[PDB]
Every structure is written in structure tokens, then in C-alpha cells.
Ligand binder design. Structure first.
Ligand SMILES: Nc1ncnc2c1ncn2[C@@H]1O[C@H](COP(=O)(O)OP(=O)(O)O)[C@@H](O)[C@H]1O
Ligand SMILES: Nc1ncnc2c1ncn2[C@@H]1O[C@H](COP(=O)(O)OP(=O)(O)O)[C@@H](O)[C@H]1O
Ligand SMILES: Nc1ncnc2c1ncn2[C@@H]1O[C@H](COP(=O)(O)OP(=O)(O)O)[C@@H](O)[C@H]1O
Ligand SMILES: Nc1ncnc2c1ncn2[C@@H]1O[C@H](COP(=O)(O)OP(=O)(O)O)[C@@H](O)[C@H]1O
Lengths: 408, 408, 408, 408
């Protein structure tokens, strides 16, 4: 769909993800390839398949984020499944086809909500005419000067102008309606009333299929958790099973959905792993083949942490400022304040368990717990979160490890 | 259906698969027999059953390809199922009948897609008459001169010709429509309706049944993994269970589809295994009888690799060239550049895990990750992939084994 | 139904099965008894139940074949279930009622296809009148000389005569139709069009029930696999369970099908076993009672093998000749050629695993693999498969045991 | 319903079951009580519940027979369930409610069949009027003389009488029909329609509920196999679980049928066990309370065998005679011939495994396998089965034990 060059894709991705440039280019080549395909002939369009990617890296460093923004950047249906979610099907459990179903039920919850945007003006334009007709019951067979029904547009224009907020005046209009009612109702009762007429069925739902088949993006988290490990055997065939079960989906097949027959042949798959226990070559042959692209993501550094705090669009720090504004409070982060927030986050991750950038949300959130509460009773103030503030609120917590496993 | 002699079939298969002539001949006789049967009399048409084949050979050497191209050659419904899938039905699992159901659901998504083909022309040749009849409302009672109609075929033709591109001009036409939607859209909405009213829904779905029963092709992958092994016993019963469960399908029976009742008596089965652990004689006797054909496929040599790289139709090397051209880049592989790509792929397979030809895809992709990204910014250029380039991009990675298990 | 004497039944069975005369008479007494029952009074018709048989013998010696031809000989609904198919239901798995359902879904797929025979002339007789009426639009209210609408039968007879192959002349006829179309379509569109009128519902489907209840034949393969063995206990109750589960079906009960309520009280059951591990007396008491008839089948001999090769109707050898004819090739088997085919088959079965007559299909098929391929390029020739040919093509294979487990 | 005194019930049971008088008396009081209850007042009709019985005795000695004849004597719905069936529900299994569902589905297949009885006369007495009204189209306005109609009862009677056999003469009659189908068929089609329009569908299915609730008879076989044993523990909980699950059914509750809501409060339960391993006092206490009646059934003696062979109604010996007569053969058993048949049956039971009276069926069948086949070719003859014949056909087999475990 999008005509963005890889380089432009990576750029656009740099607005939400710090670092991890390689994974960015990998995911960017993939998207651009979908464009590259449509520019080919009949034969070669069937033959050319998605270049599925296998992202390799430690927790919370941007794997899913990259895949989510990539998806969002191409207004593509996106689904994220955890691979072990099927390791129990040997006893019972969701079938893998569910992936394509969900990638469909959300590929719908998408075309639906996005059919409310396109149809949010129609009910308030060529449909607000409902009340205006009961405000000034049109002439007995309008004449015909294509400006005659635009003429009032004096008596008329006055009713539409006064309808800029003034209502609650009960009337009635038209299974059409007829029923007598208000306007904080007849008007809204009109919103949906005239909107279901513009949107049809066998195209809306027929399109979700079109999307999924053409722009679907499946993200299989922890694919490494379904590889074989030298600890047992019974659980391995269980794992290797999910691999075989996943095989049809990435090799090309047909799945049944209560919306129609979906074809996976062109769904893009981004698998994800840590590969500390297993290695990508432990994946079954058929799967390694369908996972041509391999890209690693590095662990995050304190500097990456500082940058993640403020650089992205709608960064946690930015959001925070916004939210405190809601309370009429002006929050401000000095460079050293942020340098310390990141510092703390790094400390806890190093002293206890490493959870990557996630740690910033809990640290940031604890740090602010006080302002968040008092925010309403501080209205009209300029609060500055500087290094001092940061230290007074986090030091004790970070310093105390056992407490860190609970509170941070 | 096809009237191709076995020899002609093998030829047409030679266009996609390198070597493996014995397996080609085997799969060829099978097809030719479906014809041979329809040439017999009433009685003999029930007696003569498919000559199911059991392909024996190492991973990624052409077994599935041969079968998929065989089916795609006879426009036959094709399903590939991993036998071990049903090993878990013992605790709960996809029924084996599912194989014939899915064979049907894709045999539907097939006859249905190939339906949009013939109804994509007349679908929009009688669809024009619609938009035209509202740009030149026909006279009150056409004058039966079977040319008095083709009169505008003056005024008329002007719109048809001016409708060869210049459109997107709001209109109104006809549960028919009656609405006043743009021409760009009337046209679109029209594609549907005229196409639909042109499709016999009953005979449609009844045809998929006809296909499955007549030209169905089931490929049971890794059947050798459901044979008995001297490692345990509990699994052997479940393993052998899947054979007993599969037994009715290849012996002849009736399964219930949500599209009708299908009979498996003439579906062609191509079973596949590596048979390193078990031997074909380990299959239950009822099954060995239904797999009269045994053909081995040899492992691929580096020479096979070089050829698989450029020789087939839409070979991966050709595909890359096509894709890069979409970007305006002329890509060319020198004989030695290709000799070296195959060389590398063989190396990782001998060095690490042998995944057959699948390995060329990952090497080839890693080799081009650079060009693929820069493509757009390299427009109008003649990039040449020779031995130098190849060695500069793969050698280090290939030489580093542990890295190979991750990146190649 | 059939009024055939046992002796006549056995005769008719001798046309497909070599030897196994005892099992033939056993199965013959059973069929004749169903006739014997209908010739009795009210009371005795309820009381007299089928004399279910337990066939005892080694693999592939004619057990199922005998039961299939018996079934076919009486145009009776037939189903073949593998007994262990239910040993896993303790964890999950098909319920035994499925037997009666499938014996119904196929007792339908039967009455349906056999309703297409009876109705294959009606659409091409009292229904081909469709086109003939648009070829010569009948008079405005035909007169009435019962030979007046037989009069044309000059203009008329000329249209029906020219309709012996000449079509593709588009017309139109009549939710009737009306729609304009061709004749390689309007004519076929008429085939089914006028056929669904003759066949009704509540009799067609109502009859399948009637068949199953009256002439149903259930073949429980490997009943011996669900008997108790002195190796464990947990799996025995699992086995003994299938026995208890099967009990209602052969003792007399009601099962629910999406076609109606079926009564098993008169379904004939032919159980089958090898009984090498267990003995029929290991079956539970209630089951031994319902399995009154016991008959053994002997292992096959080389001579039996030679006879099976050529004697039965549509024997593999005969079929082969037929199929090669399709290619315009004349195949011929000399006595010694066949003596050797059987010989080889016996050798492999004795040197590796014995699979009875099955072995002949794989041997025969390997032997011919070459002619089968070249058949098209040999058109108009007289190929003789004699002892020499046989030996040149099979010796090496049979002689090599490990190879025999793969290729033969 | 039945107004039979217990003593009269036992008498009527004596017609099918030899001995086991105590069990007959026990099952007799139970029936008589259902009457005794309906004779009480409002209150006491809720209080008085069935007096469920627990039959204790070796296999094949008359337990199930007694219960089936008891039910068939009261035209009551009867279901026999093997208790151990639900032992596997622990991992997955038929719900115990299924017992009351199936009781209903056969209680339907019952009231529905017994519906075709009363609608098999008037079904084809008003069905004639149809075919007659088209062979003697009634006058325009019959002349109200309630005999002016029975006038042809001249012309009319001629067709009715000539319709006592001579038919199969194409006609036409009337969604009614209107079609022109043969008389043989109009007649057939007529059987249906007139029968159907004569059946109150609502009251039909509502009656099955009435039966199950009022005269239902559940026979829970081998309940002793769900009592606790000092062999394990895990199975005891599941074993005991089935008792707890069965508990609501015999204590009084409501189950959901796909034909309505059924209440078990008055279903009569006859439990059955061998109780060699467990003792009735091992049933859970809540269950022992619901099984107030305990009756033992003695093992069968050879004298019992001789009597079971000829004494009952439609005894197996009588049945054979009937069946052979269908072939025109007069079969006769001499007193000593029968004494010897029983003798053999007792012998195999003492020699091998004791399967009770069930053993007479297999011996009797093996003994007649010869006559049964030759029957037709023996027409018009007086074959006599005496001691000589018997000994000549059974002795060798009986004496050979291992052979007995297979053939008898
Ligand atoms: N490189 C990064 N740039 C921006 N945010 C990041 C980065 N890495 C992690 N995060 C933040 O941390 C959370 C971790 O999830 P995610 O990014 O999906 O990675 P993973 O899939 O490895 O757990 C996300 O909500 C994201 O906002
Ligand atoms: N002989 C061959 N000729 C052409 N391509 C091959 C050959 N062998 C393998 N391949 C390529 O490698 C992949 C391996 O899959 P496949 O051919 O199905 O074999 P297998 O069933 O053994 O895995 C295929 O996509 C195919 O394009
Ligand atoms: N006695 C026989 N006469 C003819 N064909 C036989 C005979 N025994 C086996 N066969 C052939 O071998 C195959 C083995 O299956 P079947 O006859 O059902 O026996 P089983 O049930 O013991 O395996 C059949 O397809 C049949 O054509
Ligand atoms: N006392 C008896 N009188 C008549 N027939 C009997 C008797 N005992 C057993 N039988 C015959 O043997 C078979 C055994 O089954 P059944 O009578 O149900 O007893 P059980 O429930 O102990 O197995 C029945 O079909 C029946 O015809």
C-alpha cells in the first residue's frame, strides 16, 4: 500500500523506537517488498512470498514495538500471539488457525471503526437535514432552481446556525421512527440512523479478508520457547508440534473464519526469540526456510534509556506532562532529572531481574505517584522534577533490593 | 483432465524442480492414470484405484515441490498435512477427517477464485451497459433492427471510449441500488452485482466436491514419524493409531464436509518420509498396500544448488532481479557469483545442520540485505553480483559457525 | 432382499475371492438368514437377531474383501471401523455411535448416487423437452389427438434427431430461469434442473434409515486389539471399555443421526481379528454371546497368489491390461510370468514382513513401473510380460532385503 | 398402566426366563407398585418413590432378560447402560445425564413407531378414497342421503375390490401432489401424507416424556465395577465419582432432553453386579439407600440349560425350526439331542470360561452351521437332530479346549 522507501520507513520508525536500526531496516525491507510485488506480472506475483523475519534479542528492547509501529505505519492488520499458547494443545488448547481468525476479527474491528471516521460527517451533513426538515417542513414539492432549496439558507441557514449547540427542544421524525422525542436524542438517534445506509456488508467484511491476505502481520512472540532443549523429550515433541502446526500458516494455506476463507500465502510473519537456551537452527528445517531474515537487537543502555524517556513522540515523559496539564499543573524535567530516572531504572534491572525498557514505566510511575495524587490541589503551579526530586523519591526504593522486587 | 503423456508431465515438472527424475516419473504415471481410468468401462472404473506414492528422501530436496507442481499442473486441489499433527489427538486433536475437510475448503477457495476469472470480463462488459444507460438513457422501445441499438454506437461509443479512463463522475443507478453514488463507485459496485448474478452458487460448491473426489491430492508429510520405534511403547500405540485413523481415507470412505459429502476413493495420496529411524516396511500392512509406489529422492549436490538458483522458472535469482527492477535497478549474477552462493549454502549445511535447498534462500537473502535496502536510492544503476561481492558479504558469516546457526 | 441361496451367494463371492470357502459360507448363511427372517410371523421377527460373525485369520487373506463383496452383493450399506479407533476415548476420541452415523452418512451417499441413476434418463426424456419447446414453440393450446404432439415428430423429430450432438446455439428458457444462455449449458442446466422434481425428501433420507436398520453391515477390524493382554492393566480397562461401548450396538439399541433415529437390532456385524496375542474367549462374555459365528481363514499360498493374480474379475493383472490398452498397448502375461510374480511376492513376505496378498499389488506395480511410463511411446505394440521380463525387473529388488523394506 | 398382580407378572415372565423366581418376584412388586401409587392421594403420590432393585448374580443367568421382559411387559421405555462407561469421563466421557437422554430418544423411537401402528389402517382407509376419487370422480355436490354416497358402493365397490391386488396403473392426484404418478406409487405416496396428517406431532413427543417419567426403566449393568477396591486409589475416586454422578438420577432430579425437560423421580432403576470383588455395602451410602431391594440370582444348571433351550416362547430351538421351515425343511430335536446340546454348553463353560446361558447360542449355532447352509438344497425333507448328530458335530470341538476358546 504505502509507497514509502525503506529509508523513509526506517525514518518514520525512528519516531517511536530508539536505536535497533538493523531490525528497523529488516522490517522496512519487508514492507517495501510488498509494494515491489504488486509491480510485477501474473506469474511472479504468486511465486514471490513474504520474507519472514526472525528477531533475536533480550526482553523489552523494541521487538514488538518495531512490529507494531511497522504494522500501524502501513495501516495493516496486526496480531501478536505467544508461541507457547499452543504447547498445551496436546492435552487441549487453542488451535493455531485462531491466529488467522483473530488477525481477522481485529482486521474487522479495524475496518469497522475506520468506517465510522469516513461516516461521521455524512450523518452530520446529508443527515442533519432530518431535524431541519421538522424545523421548517419543506415546501409541497420543492420547485427547482438548484438554489431554491438553498434560498432559506436565510430561514434555513438560521436554523442550522442556531443548531451550533442549542437543542433539547422535543419534536419528532421518522421502521423509520415516527416516535416523538427530544433532540439531545432525535439528533443523536440520527447519527447512527443515517450512517448504516452508507456502509454496506459484502464489501466491508469482504475487505477485512482482502487486508489480512494482503497486509496481515503476525508476530509470534517467543518462538524460541518451542524449540528443542536437552532437558527432556516428551515436552519437545509437544514444542516441535507447535512448530509443525505453525508450518501451514507460513508455508501457505487456507483457514476458515466466520467472515470467509482467508489465504495466508502473503501474510508477513515476524517471529521473536531470546535464544539463550536454543538457537535459531534448533527450529525445524521447514521453519528456518520460511524465516529467511535474521536480525538481532542489542540490549538497551543507560543512554538508550535516557533517550527513550524523552525522544519518542508521546514518550512516557511527554504523556506525563500532558496528563498533569489536565490538572492545570505544569510539570518539567531537567536533563539531570531524566539522567537519574534512567539511572535508577538501569540499577534495578542490574541488581534484580532485567526487564529492559519496561522498568522505566514502573520507575517513572513510582516517582510521580505523589504529584499524580496531589495534582488537583496544585492547579496552576510549575512543578519541576529535577535530580533532587528524583533522588528523594527513588533512592531508598532502588537501594533496597527486596523492596525493589515488590515496588519497582 | 490433462491429456499429457507421463513424459510430457515430467517435462513440465522439469521447469520447477532440478533433478529427482525418478520421483517425477512416479508422480507422472499417477496423473496419467487418472486419465487412463476415465478411458475404461463402467466396472473397471470402480476397481482401479489411485496408485498412491511414498516418497523417501532427506529434507528440503524437492518432495513437496514435486507434489505441489504436479497438482498445480492438473489444477487439482492440494493439501499438505503433517502426520504427527494427529499424534496428540490421543489426548485431543484435529480429527484425521479434517484432512478431507480442509482439502475441500481450499478446493472451494479455489473453484470460487477461478470463478472470479470468467466473471471479470462479462462481469464488466454488461456492467458498462449499466453506467452507459444512465449517460444515454435508451429510447422508449428500442427498434428491433439489431443495429438500431448499435446506432450510438456513435453517441454511445463516445462514452464507452471516454470511459476508458476518464470517470469518477458522480451518477445514479439501480434491492438494486437507486442511490446516487459516483461513477468511479457505481462502476465498482457494478463489478460485484453483475458478477454475482453471473455465478451459479449451487453448481459452484458442488464443483469443489467434484474436484476433491476426482483430482484431490493429499500430501501426508513425515509419515515415517508415525511408524513404530524401539525407543518406547505408549507412543507407538498412538503413533500406530494415526495410521489406523488414516487407513479409511486411503482405502476409500465417506467424510462429512460443511459443503457436502465427499468420497476419498479416488483422492491421490503422496506420503513422505526421511526413513532414517523407521523403514517403509514399518508402516502397518494395510497402509503399505495402499502405497504401491516407492521412489527415492537423492540428496542435493552443489551443482544441483547452482542450477536451482537460476534454472527454474521464476527461480529465486530471477525473482530478485524482478524485484530490484521494480526499484529501477539492474541486478546481474555472474556465473562464478552464483557458483559461490551455492558453495556457501552447501558449506553451512555440511558445517551446521543440513536443511537441503532451503539453505539457498537464507544465504541469498543475507547476501542481498544490502542492495535490497539501498535499492530505491540506487535507481538507474547496473549492480552486478560477482564472486568478489558474494565473498565479501558471506565468507565471514559462513566461516563463523555459531553465527551461522543464528544468521543463516 | 436378494433371494440368493447360500450356495449361490458363495458362488457369486468366488468371483472376487480366492479360497477361504469357510468364511464364504459363514457370511453367506448370514445374508440368507435375513431373507429367512422376513418369511416369519410378527413375534419371531423381533426375536430373531443377526448371527454376527467373528472372522479369525492373518493379514490380507480376504477378510475385509469377503465382507465388502458380501455387502456389495446385497446392495447393503457397509462401514469398516478399526476397533482401536476408540481406545483413546478415555482421554477423548470418536464415540462408538459414530459407526451407526457413518453407516448412515454412507447409507445416504448411496441412496443419493443411486437416485441419480434412476434419474439420468428422466432429465433427458421428459425433460429434454425444455429446449425442443424453445426450438419449436408449441401451438397455442395443443389440440388433442394423442398423436398430434407426435405429429411433428417430422418438424419435431428433426430437432430431436439433430440434437444427437449438434448444439452450442444460444437461446433461453425458464425461480424457473428465463435467463438467456447457450445449450452446452441450457441443456445441462436442464439435467439437474429437471431431476430434483422427481426425487423427493422424506422418502430418500427416510429410506437410508430403512436400509441401515435392515441391511446394514458393520465390519469391526482388529477386534482382538481390544481384548485383555497380560502386559498391563490400565490399558486393558481402556480396551475392555471399547468392548462395553460396542456392546449396545450389537445387543440392540437406538442411536441418533442427523437423518433420524436408527435402530441397530438387525445390523449384521462381522468382527475381525488375528488372535495371535489374545483369543476370542478373551472377549467379554456379552460380546462372545453376540458373536455366535466363528470362522477361520487360512494364510495364502503361492498358488493362491497365482490365482489371485488372474482369476478374479477385474484382477490386478486384468486391470493392468485394460489400463495399458488405454495407451493403445497390448500387454500379455504368460503362465510362467505370473508364476514368478507370485513367487517374488511370496519371497518378500517370507524374508521380511508378511502382509498377505497386499504384497502382490506392490510387486506387480514395481514390475510394471517402466511400461506404465513408456506406455504412450509404445502405442500399437504387443508387449509380453514373461518369466524373463519378470526376473530382470524383480530379482535384484527381492534378493536385496533392506531394499525390499523400502521399495517392495 | 398394567393392572397385573405381581403373581400374574411373574407368570408372564416365566414365559421367557427359566427359574430366577426370586428376581421375578422382586421385579414384579416394583411394577405392581407403580399402579399402587396412582391409587393413592395427592400427597402420598410425591412421597412414594420407586423401590429400586440391585440384582446380584453371575454372568449370563437372566438379569438383563428379566428386566427387558419386565419393561416390554409394561410397554415401558428401557435403557441398559454399562456403569463403567463413565469411569473415563474423568478425562472426558459421556455425561451420566446421557442415560436419561437416550432413555428419551428410544422412548421416542418407541411412541413414534407405535404411532405408525394406529396410523397404518385409517392411514390407508382414507388413503383409498384418494385413488378412488380419481377412478370415479364424485358427483358435483353429493346428495346428502348418507347412502347416496355409498351408492357405487356399486361402481365404487368394483374399484375397491379390484384394488385388492390389481393396481400399479399410472394415475394422477393431489403442497398436495398434482403430479401424474402411477397408482402403485400414488398409493404409496398416499400411505405417508394421510398417515402424517393423522399424527398430532406435539402430543407425540410430549408423550415420550410422559413415558420416561412414568414408566422409565434404567438398567445400570455392572454397577459393582464402580465400587471401591483395595487394589489402588486413583481409580476409586473416579469409580466412586460415577456413583456420585448417578446419585441425582436415582434420588430425583431434572435433566435436559432435546425433546424437553424430564424428571427422574419415578424412573425405576434396576442395578446389576456380580459382586465377587466388591460387596453391595461398598456402594456409597446415599446409593444403598436408593437400592432398597436386593435379590440374588442363582447360577444356571444343565437342567436349566435344557429348559432354556426349548421351553421359552420363541426359544432358540423353536427359532431354528422356524428359520429352517422358511427353507421348507422340517427340523426336529429329540429329547436326548437337546440333553446333549446343553451338556456340551455346560462342558465348555466348566472347561474354559463360564459365560452362562450365552454359551447355548454358540454351541447351537456351531451345531447347525451344516444344515443352515444346505437348507435350500434339502427342501421338503425331515431332518432330525438327535444325540448321534449332536455328538458327531460337537464332541471333537468340545473336547479340544484351545479350539473351544476360538470356535465355541
Ligand atoms: N528501542 C526502544 N525504543 C522505544 N521504546 C522501547 C524500546 N525498547 C523497548 N521499549 C519500550 O518497552 C516496552 C517493551 O516491549 P517491546 O518494545 O515490545 O519489546 P519486547 O518485545 O522485546 O518485549 C514497550 O512498551 C516500549 O515502549
Ligand atoms: N530439486 C529441487 N528443485 C528445485 N527447488 C528445490 C528442490 N529441492 C528443494 N527445492 C526448494 O527448497 C524448498 C524445500 O521444500 P520442498 O521442495 O518441499 O522439499 P521437502 O519436502 O523435502 O522439504 C522448496 O521451496 C523448493 O523451492
Ligand atoms: N483370498 C483372497 N482373494 C482375492 N483377493 C484377496 C484375498 N486375500 C487378500 N486379497 C487382496 O488383498 C487385500 C487385503 O485386504 P483384505 O482382503 O481385506 O484382507 P484383510 O482384511 O485380512 O487385510 C485386498 O485388497 C484383496 O484384493
Ligand atoms: N434364566 C434364563 N432364562 C432364559 N434365558 C436366559 C436365562 N439366563 C440367560 N439367558 C439367555 O442368555 C443371554 C444372557 O443375557 P442376560 O439374560 O441378559 O443375563 P446377564 O445380564 O447376566 O448377562 C440372554 O440373551 C438370554 O436369552
Amino acid at each position: 500500500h504505502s509507497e514509502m522507501t525503506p529509508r523513509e520507513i526506517v525514518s518514520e520508525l525512528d519516531k517511536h523506537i530508539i536505536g535497533q536500526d538493523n531490525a528497523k531496516r529488516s522490517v522496512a525491507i519487508a514492507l517495501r517488498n510488498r509494494w515491489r510485488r504488486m509491480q510485477l506480472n501474473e506469474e511472479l506475483r504468486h511465486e514471490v512470498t513474504p520474507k519472514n523475519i526472525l528477531m533475536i534479542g533480550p526482553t523489552g528492547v523494541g521487538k514488538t514495538e518495531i512490529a507494531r509501529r511497522l504494522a500501524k505505519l502501513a495501516n495493516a492488520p496486526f496480531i501478536k500471539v505467544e508461541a507457547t499458547k499452543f504447547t498445551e494443545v496436546g492435552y487441549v488448547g487453542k488451535e493455531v488457525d485462531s491466529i488467522i481468525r483473530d488477525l481477522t476479527d481485529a482486521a474487522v474491528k479495524m475496518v469497522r471503526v475506520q468506517a465510522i471516521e469516513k461516516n461521521r460527517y455524512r450523518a452530520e451533513e446529508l443527515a442533519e437535514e432530518r431535524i431541519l426538515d421538522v424545523l421548517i417542513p419543506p415546501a409541497k414539492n420543492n420547485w427547482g432552481q438548484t438554489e431554491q432549496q438553498q434560498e432559506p439558507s436565510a430561514a434555513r441557514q438560521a436554523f442550522r446556525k442556531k443548531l451550533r449547540e442549542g437543542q433539547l427542544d422535543d419534536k419528532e421524525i421518522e421502521k423509520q421512527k415516527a416516535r416523538k422525542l427530544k433532540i439531545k436524542d432525535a439528533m443523536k438517534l440520527l447519527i447512527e440512523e443515517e450512517a448504516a445506509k452508507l456502509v454496506n456488508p459484502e464489501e466491508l467484511k469482504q475487505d477485512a479478508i482482502d487486508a489480512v491476505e494482503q497486509h496481515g502481520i503476525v508476530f509470534i512472540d517467543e518462538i524460541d520457547k518451542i524449540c528443542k532443549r536437552g532437558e527432556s523429550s516428551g515436552p519437545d515433541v509437544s514444542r516441535e508440534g507447535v512448530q509443525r502446526d505453525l508450518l501451514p500458516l507460513v508455508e501457505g494455506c487456507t483457514v476458515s473464519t466466520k467472515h470467509g476463507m482467508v489465504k495466508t500465502d502473503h501474510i508477513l510473519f515476524i517471529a521473536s526469540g531470546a535464544f539463550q537456551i536454543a538457537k535459531p537452527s534448533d527450529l525445524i528445517p521447514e521453519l528456518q526456510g520460511r524465516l529467511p531474515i535474521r536480525v538481532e537487537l542489542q540490549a538497551l543502555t543507560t543512554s538508550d534509556f535516557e533517550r527513550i524517556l524523552t525522544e519518542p513522540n508521546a514518550s512516557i515523559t511527554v504523556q506525563y506532562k500532558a496528563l498533569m496539564a489536565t490538572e492545570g499543573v505544569n510539570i518539567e524535567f531537567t536533563d539531570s532529572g531524566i539522567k537519574r530516572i534512567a539511572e535508577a531504572a538501569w540499577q534495578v534491572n542490574e541488581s534484580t531481574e532485567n526487564i529492559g525498557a519496561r522498568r522505566l514505566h514502573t520507575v517513572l510511575e513510582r516517582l510521580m505517584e505523589e504529584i499524580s495524587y496531589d495534582a488537583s490541589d496544585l492547579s496552576g503551579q510549575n512543578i519541576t522534577i529535577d535530580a533532587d526530586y528524583v533522588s528523594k523519591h527513588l533512592d531508598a526504593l532502588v537501594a533496597d533490593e527486596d523492596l525493589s522486587r515488590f515496588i519497582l
